[PDB]
Ligand binder design. Structure first.
Ligand code: NA
Ligand SMILES: [Sm+3]
Ligand SMILES: [Sm+3]
Length: 295
């Protein structure tokens, strides 16, 4: 969905216009640029004819996007992926007479991290508007980010190929034993929601009892009045002094490696063998290649 911000600010001016005359004259005028009439129990048939001075584009002047930003919304949902086999090596103490502490090789995996977002409730602001949102990943241990385009249905996908590495581990291998070390990359994903915000300025133009040819008041004050009165639906607008803040929404998701698990098997009797030990190993991350796209 999309909010046409400029058109909604024009309707904001029309709401204040009609609502204020309805109080003044007990009429039932609707927000409109068209001439309309209404029967007042205290006044008779009354006419509302907005002049060319205020109609259409001239309902708002000094319209400006002042700032735009995006913030994490709620608690993202993290999940664990299927572990990915990374390789294996042998720790051979079959000919040794002493127990040894033997260092494993480093294991590695070439992984494509992906971050994507979708603008689900867009803001049509009259100018290309973007904002970057940051979120924690991997149970709060790293920070990631994603750039929203505020137009409805905008999608972004960013990928990085990275190399994950497990540091060498020290394994006790008893005399005469042969051990096998198998390595697996653990993965995770995250998804969540973003709030999209724009602070916009402007002056709303209405005919009114005090200004029968039209007068202008900042949109922040006009919105404050209209929300207090119940004139029109501006549920995703908030006053901010003379300006208003308008809110949209997006989604995001991301995937990444989390760590390595090493599985130690006794293969002395020769062919999988008994698992003797498992080790969680923190990975070392090195970026190789990156690619950006927007749809
Ligand atoms: Na409208
Ligand atoms: Sm909320
Ligand atoms: Sm939520």
């Amino acid at each position: 969905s999309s909010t046409d911000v400029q058109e909604r600010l024009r309707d904001l001016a029309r709401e204040d216009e009609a609502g204020t005359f309805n109080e003044a004259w007990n009429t039932n005028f609707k927000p409109s640029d068209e001439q309309q009439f209404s029967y007042s129990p205290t006044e008779g048939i009354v006419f509302l004819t907005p002049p060319k001075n205020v109609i259409g584009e001239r309902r708002i002047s000094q319209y400006k996007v002042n700032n735009a930003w995006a913030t994490l919304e709620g608690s993202p949902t993290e999940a664990s992926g299927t572990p990915l086999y990374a390789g294996k090596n042998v720790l051979d103490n079959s000919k040794g007479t002493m127990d040894q502490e033997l260092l494993t090789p480093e294991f590695n995996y070439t992984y494509t991290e992906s971050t994507s977002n979708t603008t689900t409730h867009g803001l049509k602001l009259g100018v290309k508007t973007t904002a970057t949102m940051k979120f924690p990943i991997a149970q709060g241990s790293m920070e990631a980010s994603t750039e929203y385009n505020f137009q409805n249905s905008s999608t972004d996908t960013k990928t990085k190929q990275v190399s994950y590495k497990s540091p060498s581990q020290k394994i006790k291998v008893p005399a005469g034993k042969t051990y096998r070390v198998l390595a697996y990359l653990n993965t995770g994903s995250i998804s969540g929601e973003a709030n999209l915000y724009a602070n916009v300025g402007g002056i709303a133009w209405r005919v009114s009892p005090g200004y029968p040819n039209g007068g202008g008041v900042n949109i922040g004050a006009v919105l404050t009045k209209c929300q207090q009165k119940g004139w029109g639906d501006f549920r995703n607008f908030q006053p901010s002094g003379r300006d208003v803040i308008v809110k949209g929404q997006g989604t995001f998701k991301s995937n990444y490696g989390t760590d390595f698990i090493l599985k130690i098997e006794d293969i002395t009797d020769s062919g999988s063998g008994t698992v003797v030990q498992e080790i969680k190993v923190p990975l070392i991350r090195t970026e190789i290649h990156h690619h950006h796209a927007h749809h």
